[PDB]
Write a protein that binds this ligand. Structure first.
Ligand SMILES: *[C@@H]1O[C@H](CO)[C@@H](O[C@@H]2O[C@H](CO)[C@@H](O)[C@H](O)[C@H]2NC(C)=O)[C@H](O)[C@H]1NC(C)=O
Ligand SMILES: *[C@@H]1O[C@H](CO)[C@@H](O[C@@H]2O[C@H](CO)[C@@H](O)[C@H](O)[C@H]2NC(C)=O)[C@H](O)[C@H]1NC(C)=O
Ligand SMILES: Nc1nc2c(ncn2[C@@H]2O[C@H](COP(=O)(O)O)[C@H]3OP(=O)(O)O[C@H]32)c(=O)[nH]1
Ligand SMILES: Nc1nc2c(ncn2[C@@H]2O[C@H](COP(=O)(O)O)[C@H]3OP(=O)(O)O[C@H]32)c(=O)[nH]1
Ligand SMILES: *[C@@H]1O[C@H](CO)[C@@H](O)[C@H](O)[C@H]1NC(C)=O
Ligand SMILES: *[C@@H]1O[C@H](CO)[C@@H](O)[C@H](O)[C@H]1NC(C)=O
Ligand SMILES: *[C@@H]1O[C@H](CO)[C@@H](O)[C@H](O)[C@H]1NC(C)=O
Ligand SMILES: *[C@@H]1O[C@H](CO)[C@@H](O)[C@H](O)[C@H]1NC(C)=O
Ligand SMILES: *[C@@H]1O[C@H](CO)[C@@H](O)[C@H](O)[C@H]1NC(C)=O
Ligand SMILES: *[C@@H]1O[C@H](CO)[C@@H](O)[C@H](O)[C@H]1NC(C)=O
Ligand SMILES: *[C@@H]1O[C@H](CO)[C@@H](O)[C@H](O)[C@H]1NC(C)=O
Ligand SMILES: *[C@@H]1O[C@H](CO)[C@@H](O)[C@H](O)[C@H]1NC(C)=O
Ligand SMILES: *[C@@H]1O[C@H](CO)[C@@H](O)[C@H](O)[C@H]1NC(C)=O
Ligand SMILES: *[C@@H]1O[C@H](CO)[C@@H](O)[C@H](O)[C@H]1NC(C)=O
Ligand SMILES: *[C@@H]1O[C@H](CO)[C@@H](O)[C@H](O)[C@H]1NC(C)=O
Ligand SMILES: *[C@@H]1O[C@H](CO)[C@@H](O)[C@H](O)[C@H]1NC(C)=O
Ligand SMILES: *[C@@H]1O[C@H](CO)[C@@H](O)[C@H](O)[C@H]1NC(C)=O
Ligand SMILES: *[C@@H]1O[C@H](CO)[C@@H](O)[C@H](O)[C@H]1NC(C)=O
Lengths: 774, 773
């Protein structure tokens, strides 16, 4: 189909609209820029390679470049691979970029550069130099950046990339950068706010530095500023997961009461981890447009009960007061100032880490008349006692979050404690259902109906990671008549009663994954036929339950479309010679997707496929140790579309796939032990659209197995990490791979000859077998 | 050193005392008996192979054989491998055994044989034919077995190996086998007790059959019988994990009151799963010596409160009454007859699956004066309430088992429910003293008074409860003698460094699989709690996902062993964060540290300097380790064992001896090593054990493996590499063939991968004479 094989080890994409030729060589194990990059390339990404220098030769012909991404070709030792350390910093020879008259964006992060590269073109709007060794900014080195709008200089001096001195910035270094909108000097060991800064700035990042004091002039001229982040200067270091040095004399970051007066356009102020003890109202006199305020990880426990500053914040949308607790103090109650009633526009309130014993309805009264309140997050508070019925006055909320508490009768997992949650790297949920109460990771042992009195509006309840060891019998959730989603994962469900959960008449999704406990002990009655009573259930997750026994022999539903049954013991239930459970799933009449991966199914007894429900479309048998498979039995699965046999020990494919299924579109066989294909494997398999044979032991593929009238209809064919022998017997396959339009990933990287000797480790895409045609 | 390489793919042991020559060819993927088997072989095992026939050639020279184990060369389809099914039953030609004049034992289990093999020599004492397809026994087929003592015929007709008819035994089939001692007809679809049986019988196994009725005279002559097992005839089928058919009209197995009158030597009576409703005392009239009685999986719930039969069993040692509950009944109390007090000799009482709500002290009062009682098993009873102080009257017991209950403020896992717990295959803190096992209960909160009067306990098992408490040293105050606490599979909240410090005699603490509170950010955890435990020897903290700690150091003057696998030292030792690099340094007496499975893809500098001084055994297995600075082992002056198995290492050090002068045992199995360094083991005089198996090694040269080190090795593992057998490999091939160093699997998985000719061939068989023309 193609007249010229694509030999370039980079993906190449078009956007004729925007006149773009996108060349992506990310992580291609390159040690030189590859020859034959298109002359018309506009976007060239060389991120995560080992190219040791840049020169006028590098981009010679490439005069139409608007963006070079040359990140992490020499990462700082502590940030980078320890098995392939960069021996010496990127060397940039003079005149490498001056040619590139259209260059708009240059990322040179993670290259251990010692200086801001000179001779940059005046077209440059974005320069990124994070994670280098540049720790002295001189005005002279910035004259080249006349038209720069975005400048990232952070991570040049911190614990993962130390420079062992204070950061230096010359007086007025940035002032003549008259179009500069975004300046980031984070994670840099900076000691003072650099002045004077250009009045064009909209975003200023100075977080995770060693700034002890703001001078009252520091932000005088910054009347277009919309985002200011001063977090992590005088950090709160308790339980820090990074080396954390507090300001001496236990000082806060010292901010004069009028420091923000010029900042009339400010929308986001981040004062996280500044050891603040008070928030002066005077801070907010001349900002009424502030929408986001982060005051997490300070010492503001007393202030929260006072908080007059809140009176000045009527347009505030998000407020974070998390982790403000006084060390070794466990308060009886939460004490919110009445001032919270003045946050008319508030949508998100987060107060984790206040640390208190009992939540009472009255303590939340100041929020009662906030009409736009959508999220109330009281996670990680060691709350022992909360009458959940108080949330009847919060029907308007989307999320009520009490996760990680001590109650008994998404932000990243590291959010409040991580050093820099916006760090760029260089290694290679039920809310949508409506109102959600998150009681995950609490100490709830026993539940009953009255616990949920007045909460019938709830659409999602998260009970994940509690201690519920109850024989649920369908009387425990009686008020929750509108619940569509129940997360009961990581409890100890005792499924004695086939009536469990039946009172949840609106339930569409039930997760009882990781409730293995009672399934582990012999002689205990379990009723897996409990699905019969759940009349509108669409999806059931029963993963990692260690299920090896069941009192009932069949599960029935007229609604269920998805069953996840991974991490059980169907191998035990279907022990060879025991026919009793071979119809376990047969009566799930509307089931379209069944995951029975990780069931130790080293073989499938006869009867399993005949026992499958009739509309089954997607079947996973992945990670079962399957050593054999009677392909002809797929004839029983008349609606089968996707079969996943990945990570098994299969050694063969069927003589004729066409004869095993009329319907099969997507066949996943990756990570098996297949050494060759059958002579007529895919002949007449016209319905096939996706075939994964990667990570097998295939040596040879011939046209009889892989007819072109089937291959050329595939959306993807995965062939990498096989054992291809590149002899004259391989001429057809090599020609066909070189010349096909069918998508085949990792050609540049992992579609390799293993022999014979001449060709060992050679990419098949580059292979020249002219000697076979002499 | 050896003159003649051993090419036989079987293990050969010599045992001069017993005149034995043992040849074990178990599981060697054989399709014929190997040539060259020693002429003097006495014990030949060919179990789990695919040898399709036996003939007079099979054992021609082997006239000294006393035992042939030829099990599972053609196993019934449902019992055998589905990836490598047997095509055709084993064929045994005439005269294959008749010349083996000294043959005492013949195992032919799992061969799909249709008939008892004939032409067996008169020396034979043991014949095993389990899991064949022999379901009719005729007296004429047994006349050859005149001297047989042990006969195994079970598993020839059951759900895993069906024959589709009742088993048949001709009348008096076994009568003339006048030395027969052990007869097993289990798992056979037998419908009646075969009679008349020889009076020499000592053990009779008739379990898992279809016997509905015992006749009064079925055991009339069996005056030497010691073990009788009638289990699984009229089974109790509730929650059975196999296809189970009960006798009609839930009838019990019907046993006349006088059925056991001749059995005056009987020691063991097994009546498990016989659907019994009553135990007639009359059964035991003439049986004075009974030591073991299994009455599990019946319907004896009412009988347990009456149990007049116990008055006839003063010599009984073990009694099992487990899983006798009445379906859909949850009793308030346990009701043990006063008759239990006559069980003078009793050591073990098991009453699981009685199913009752509340245990009270007085309910165990018939056991108070059983002076020999050692085990009381009340597991799997759904008990909700039990004042643990009641066990102050049971200080004499070794184990009190309350595992699997619902209490709140070593038998195999499928013991009571499995079909045949003695079937053969074709494929703990008790030692510390008095043990209370509270594992798999609903205990959510503990306090000192819970353990009032239990100060005698040496081991407490709290594994698999709900305990989510900030233990502070006040919860176990009565347990002054406790040596072992298993606290695994709870939700320990390690806020206080005083946790567990009241257990002043604690030697072993298991707090593994308490990951819950280590999974959420911002929670204070005090890993320095070890300082307060003054005689703690072993601490297990596996699978806790620990990625953070408020304290920077763990301290102990006593701890010898720390297991810390399945945590996140990778996060604690994040490169550039030095704060936790001495976490283990102050465990001054530590000799063993397991930090496997901690995602340590590299080791930061400072880890080895920070290890405690007497560290001897270190596991860094399963870490995805991609590089290792061998020279840093010089910090570990007492290191003897280093486990780097299942990682991604590609190189060995230039000279191991220069990295460590103490190292004895080096495990490098399952890495990516493709070559050894030129002088790898030079002068490594302390090395005793080296595992390089499951790497990618192509060649080994003599310089890497000097003979003055090799000859000190106790074991050298090289199997499953990528050995290239060219003339460059001459030294290695010769050396492997002639060394006395122990190399496992030396003919099985030490194989050439090339060149083409020798591909797949064992290096031990390789002739490389063309390299020397
Ligand atoms: C941030 O700057 C400070 C200096 O202000 C660096 O601290 C110095 O480090 C050197 C080398 O460790 C010491 O000899 C000096 O005494 C230190 N001075 C002070 C004032 O502490 C610090 O190393 C820098 N941080 C990073 C991560 O590079
Ligand atoms: C045990 O013996 C019984 C008969 O005594 C076998 O049951 C017969 O099985 C065949 C074929 O499956 C049926 O056609 C007959 O109807 C059965 N007879 C009765 C009375 O049930 C049974 O198959 C045997 N069991 C095994 C495991 O082989
Ligand atoms: N781990 C834990 N901490 C608690 C609890 N109750 C209050 N806290 C407090 O929450 C903080 C985070 O954990 C701890 O630091 P601190 O202030 O000494 O007191 C602790 C509890 O039940 N558990
Ligand atoms: N699973 C379970 N079974 C219990 C419980 N309490 C009593 N049982 C009884 O124990 C038996 C085994 O489980 C069950 O069968 P059944 O007699 O219907 O009543 C059940 C409990 O809390 N859980
Ligand atoms: C190409 O470069 C321009 C200018 O920096 C950028 O806006 C655009 O997103 C880039 N396109 C891609 C797909 O990388
Ligand atoms: C709440 O906080 C204010 C200011 O911190 C305090 O003075 C007041 O007494 C507190 N009210 C209650 C109910 O605790
Ligand atoms: C919880 O609050 C409701 C009122 O909303 C009340 O009916 C109930 O008694 C309270 N429950 C408890 C246990 O106090
Ligand atoms: C429930 O909360 C758990 C634990 O925080 C979380 O992992 C899970 O995704 C939540 N479930 C849903 C459905 O959002
Ligand atoms: C469930 O159990 C309760 C006791 O908790 C019992 O009263 C009731 O009969 C059962 N309810 C249903 C809905 O079956
Ligand atoms: C589930 O199976 C059991 C019989 O084992 C039966 O008693 C119960 O009624 C069944 N329940 C449903 C909902 O089918
Ligand atoms: C089955 O899998 C395909 C992709 O493999 C997916 O797009 C489809 O929606 C799935 N079908 C069902 C019913 O889950
Ligand atoms: C050898 O066979 C005899 C006779 O059956 C047996 O007693 C002995 O245990 C056997 N030894 C071994 C090691 O197989
Ligand atoms: C115990 O059970 C026996 C026999 O059923 C009965 O006669 C006796 O009264 C029961 N005793 C108690 C305390 O239940
Ligand atoms: C438990 O029994 C002991 C007597 O051994 C008694 O002191 C104690 O009060 C009882 N405990 C409870 C909670 O009843
Ligand atoms: C404690 O009981 C558990 C659950 O049965 C068991 O796995 C564990 O081995 C026991 N611990 C000890 C130390 O015996
Ligand atoms: C431990 O906490 C309990 C309250 O649960 C209390 O009795 C005791 O004072 C505390 N112990 C210590 C060491 O503070
Ligand atoms: C453990 O470390 C903490 C501080 O992190 C300290 O306050 C406490 O006293 C230490 N405890 C012991 C037993 O060393
Ligand atoms: C390693 O070898 C060198 C060169 O002989 C020697 O000088 C050095 O001391 C040795 N180190 C150890 C730890 O044996």
């Amino acid at each position: 189909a193609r007249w010229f094989p694509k030999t370039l080890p980079c993906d190449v994409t078009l956007d004729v609209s925007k006149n773009h030729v996108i060349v992506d060589c990310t992580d291609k194990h390159l040690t030189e820029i590859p020859g034959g990059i298109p002359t018309n390339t506009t976007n060239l990404t060389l991120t995560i390679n080992h190219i040791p220098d840049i020169s006028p030769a590098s981009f010679h012909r490439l005069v139409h470049l608007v963006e070079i991404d040359f990140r992490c070709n020499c990462v700082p030792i502590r940030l980078g691979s320890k098995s392939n350390m960069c021996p010496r910093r990127l060397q940039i020879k003079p005149r490498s970029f001056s040619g590139l008259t259209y260059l708009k964006s240059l990322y040179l992060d993670g290259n251990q550069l010692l200086e801001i590269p000179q001779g940059l073109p005046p077209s440059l709007q974005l320069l990124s130099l994070e994670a280098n060794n540049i720790f002295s900014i001189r005005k002279e080195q910035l004259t080249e950046l006349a038209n720069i709008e975005i400048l990232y200089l952070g991570q040049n001096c911190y614990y993962r990339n130390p420079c062992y001195v204070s950061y230096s910035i010359e007086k007025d270094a940035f002032l003549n950068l008259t179009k500069l909108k975004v300046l980031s000097l984070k994670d840099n060991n900076v000691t003072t706010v650099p002045t004077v800064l250009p009045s064009t700035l909209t975003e200023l990042y100075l977080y995770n530095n060693m700034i002890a004091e703001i001078q009252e002039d520091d932000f005088n001229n910054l009347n277009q500023l919309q985002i200011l982040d001063l977090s992590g200067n005088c950090p709160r270091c308790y339980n820090a997961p990074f080396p954390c040095t507090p300001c001496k004399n236990n000082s806060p970051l010292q901010i004069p009461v009028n420091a923000f007066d010029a900042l009339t356009e400010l929308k986001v102020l981040r004062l996280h981890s500044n050891s603040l003890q008070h928030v002066p109202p005077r801070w907010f006199k001349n900002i009424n447009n502030l929408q986001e305020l982060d005051l997490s990880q300070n010492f503001l426990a007393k202030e929260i009960g006072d908080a007059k500053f809140l009176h000045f914040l009527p347009n505030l949308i998000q407020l974070d007061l998390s982790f403000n607790f006084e060390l070794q103090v466990y308060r009886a109650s939460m004490n919110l100032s009445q001032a919270f009633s003045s946050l008319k526009s508030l949508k998100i309130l987060r107060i984790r880490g206040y640390v208190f014993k009992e939540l009472k309805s009255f303590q939340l009264s100041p929020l009662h008349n906030l009409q736009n309140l959508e999220v109330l997050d009281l996670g990680t508070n060691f709350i022992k006692i909360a009458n959940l019925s108080m949330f009847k006055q919060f029907k308007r909320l989307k999320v009520i979050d009490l996760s990680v508490n001590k109650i008994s009768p998404v932000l990243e997992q590291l959010y409040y404690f991580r050093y820099d949650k916006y760090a760029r790297s260089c290694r290679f949920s039920c809310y949508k259902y409506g109102q959600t109460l998150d009681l995950s990771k609490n100490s709830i042992f026993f539940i009953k109906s009255s616990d949920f009195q007045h909460l019938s509006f709830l659409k999602c309840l998260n009970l994940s990671g509690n201690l519920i060891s109850q024989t649920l019998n369908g009387s425990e959730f009686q008020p929750l008549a509108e619940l569509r989603y129940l997360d009961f994962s990581n409890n100890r469900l005792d499924l004695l009663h086939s009536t469990a959960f039946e009172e949840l008449r609106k339930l569409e999704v039930l997760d009882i994954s990781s409730n293995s406990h009672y399934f582990q002990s012999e002689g205990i009655t379990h009723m897996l036929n409990f699905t019969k009573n759940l009349k509108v259930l669409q999806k059931l997750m029963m993963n990692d339950n260690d299920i090896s026994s069941s009192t009932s022999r069949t599960m029935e539903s007229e609604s269920l479309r998805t069953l996840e049954f991974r991490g059980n013991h169907l191998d035990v239930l279907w022990r060879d010679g025991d026919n009793r459970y071979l119809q376990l799933f047969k009566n799930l009449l509307k089931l379209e997707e069944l995951d029975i991966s990780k069931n130790s199914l080293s073989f499938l007894p006869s009867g399993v496929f005949d026992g499958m429900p009739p509309n089954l479309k997607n079947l996973s048998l992945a990670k079962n140790g399957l050593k054999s498979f009677i392909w002809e039995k797929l004839r029983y699965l008349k609606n089968l579309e996707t079969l996943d046999l990945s990570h098994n020990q299969l050694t063969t494919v069927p003589e004729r796939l066409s004869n095993c299924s009329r319907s099969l579109k997507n066949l996943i066989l990756k990570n098996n032990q297949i050494r060759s294909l059958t002579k007529y494997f895919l002949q007449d398999a016209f319905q096939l659209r996706y075939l994964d044979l990667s990570s097998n032991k295939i040596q040879m593929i011939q046209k009889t197995s892989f007819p072109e009238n089937v291959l050329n209809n595939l959306k993807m064919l995965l062939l990498h990490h096989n054992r291809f022998l590149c002899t004259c017997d391989a001429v057809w396959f090599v020609w066909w791979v070189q010349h096909t339009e069918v998508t085949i990933p990792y050609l540049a990287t992992d579609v390799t000859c293993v022999g014979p000797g001449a060709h060992k480790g050679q990419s098949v895409i580059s292979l020249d077998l002219y000697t076979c045609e002499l």
